[PDB]
Structure 1
Amino acid sequence: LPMPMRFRHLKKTSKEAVGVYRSPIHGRGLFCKRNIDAGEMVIEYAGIVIRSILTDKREKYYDSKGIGCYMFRIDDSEVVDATMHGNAARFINHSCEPNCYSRVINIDGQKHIVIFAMRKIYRGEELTYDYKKLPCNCGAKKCRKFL
């Protein structure tokens, strides 16, 4: 199905497909509630597309208020800030053998970060993607040992 046609009713369908629980990788993570087919559009990484140069001061502000800072790097110029206007996708942890991957899609001139399943994902599994200094806890055989 075409990419804009696939961005269909993600809000309703992701609410039934994924949930947030404690993760053995780190803190809380995103896990699936039902089997997700390979190639399936899982969830949008919801948030505000902001200028990359603004992230330092935004993270400094959040940190000074004891508010967890949730951001996803688009490119060297833009970042999605999911801190205030985010959804469950902000809890997706890194893995060196991920079952998901992140892509920047464009629908009706608007940029959205969407998470896709790389393989069939089975009920109970944690959803992970390769993030674009910090030790890694994915626990995979082929672990890069750093994020």
Structure 2
Amino acid sequence: GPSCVMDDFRDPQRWKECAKQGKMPCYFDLIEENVYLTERRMQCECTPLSKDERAQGEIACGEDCLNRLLMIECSSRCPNGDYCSNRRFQRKQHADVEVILTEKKGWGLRAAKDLPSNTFVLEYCGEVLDHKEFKARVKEYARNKNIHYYFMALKNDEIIDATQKGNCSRFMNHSCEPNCETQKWTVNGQLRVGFFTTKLVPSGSELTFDYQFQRYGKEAQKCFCGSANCRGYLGGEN
């Protein structure tokens, strides 16, 4: 299969014509941050790491950071300042991942390196919709006869749509037996969704998560994850 690194998405011209030669997926607007179609705090208690503790390689805002435990990211005002390891989303500290053609699912994501268990992969970025905007879009995509859908539930009246605008996170595929999960994190009072490994993911391996978004309409998409325990279709029951 053809592959490409995440830096290949930064050059729209070379991208567009790579796409014409089918060596890259179709063009979409690349964004670093969620874009609201309609516009709508305090620090952790981690004891600053001494320069020596930092040298030894001790982790700043690690497993015991009060902010991390609550899936809240520290700000510029964290007592560990620049050394805070709990600003992954804001600092784009994404895993090393490539975009690959799969036999039947379209494009996908794979580890370029071994990925430890419980590792941040990518934020799922896109246009944030309310229910009304969501229902407009479902109808628009249905009428265009789109195959690939990019909806991700954020919360009540907030659905992320990475159809037109998003990042490489939009290439991660469903599996019934996944190696990743979603986590909803608080970043500057705003909620965001990121992919995280659930196990050690060998280099070259396809990255996958259990997509549980509630099915609408009559005909559901067939699942080609190939797990022995495949549910056979994409989306949650209803």
| TMscore range, shorter length | 0.7 to 0.9
> What is the deviation of 1:70?
2.3
Aligned residues: 145
Query: Which structure shows the bigger proportion of residues in strand conformation?
Result: 1
SS for the counterpart of 2:98 is strand
Task: Indicate if the aligned counterparts of 2:154 and 2:192 stay in contact, CA closer than 8 A.
Answer: no
SS for the counterpart of 1:57 is helix
Indicate whether 1:58 and 2:137 are aligned: yes
Task: Indicate if the aligned counterparts of 1:25 and 1:93 stay in contact, CA closer than 8 A.
Answer: no
Q: Relative to structure 1, is the Cα distance of residues 102 and 44 closer, same or farther in structure 2, using a 3 angstrom cutoff?
A: same
Corresponding residue for 1:30?
Answer: 109
The separation in 2 between residues aligned to 1:9 and 1:24, in whole angstroms, is 34
The separation in 2 between residues aligned to 1:74 and 1:8, in whole angstroms, is 15
Residue by residue over 1:53-98, the C-alpha shift from the partner in whole angstroms, topping out at 9 and shown as x without a partner, is: 3122124445666886522122452211212330011011110100
- TM-score, normalised to structure 2, is 0.54
Task: Indicate if the aligned counterparts of 2:90 and 2:187 stay in contact, CA closer than 8 A.
Answer: no
Q: 1:140 aligns with which of 224, 227, 230?
A: 227
Identity %: 33
Q: Match for 1:98: what amino acid?
A: P
Q: Match for 1:119: what amino acid?
A: K
Which 10-residue stretch deviates more, 58-67 or 75-84? 58-67
Residue by residue over 1:17-60, the C-alpha shift from the partner in whole angstroms, topping out at 9 and shown as x without a partner, is: 11111113501111111111100011100113221331221244
In the alignment, structure 2 segments of 5+ residues that lack a partner are: 1-61, 63-67, 74-85, 213-219
Corresponding residue for 1:82?
Answer: 162
In the alignment, structure 1 segments of 5+ residues that lack a partner are: none
Indicate whether 1:42 and 2:121 are aligned: yes
Q: Match for 2:189: what amino acid?
A: G
State the Cα RMSD in Å: 2.3
Q: Relative to structure 1, is the Cα distance of residues 93 and 84 closer, same or farther in structure 2, using a 3 angstrom cutoff?
A: same
The separation in 1 between residues aligned to 2:116 and 2:152, in whole angstroms, is 24
Residue by residue over 1:101-131, the C-alpha shift from the partner in whole angstroms, topping out at 9 and shown as x without a partner, is: 1121111201111000000111111111101
The separation in 2 between residues aligned to 1:66 and 1:141, in whole angstroms, is 30
The separation in 2 between residues aligned to 1:120 and 1:8, in whole angstroms, is 21
Corresponding residue for 2:48?
Answer: none
The separation in 1 between residues aligned to 2:225 and 2:165, in whole angstroms, is 27
Task: Indicate if the aligned counterparts of 2:125 and 2:167 stay in contact, CA closer than 8 A.
Answer: yes
The separation in 1 between residues aligned to 2:104 and 2:149, in whole angstroms, is 18
The separation in 1 between residues aligned to 2:91 and 2:208, in whole angstroms, is 18
SS for the counterpart of 1:20 is strand
Corresponding residue for 2:88?
Answer: 7
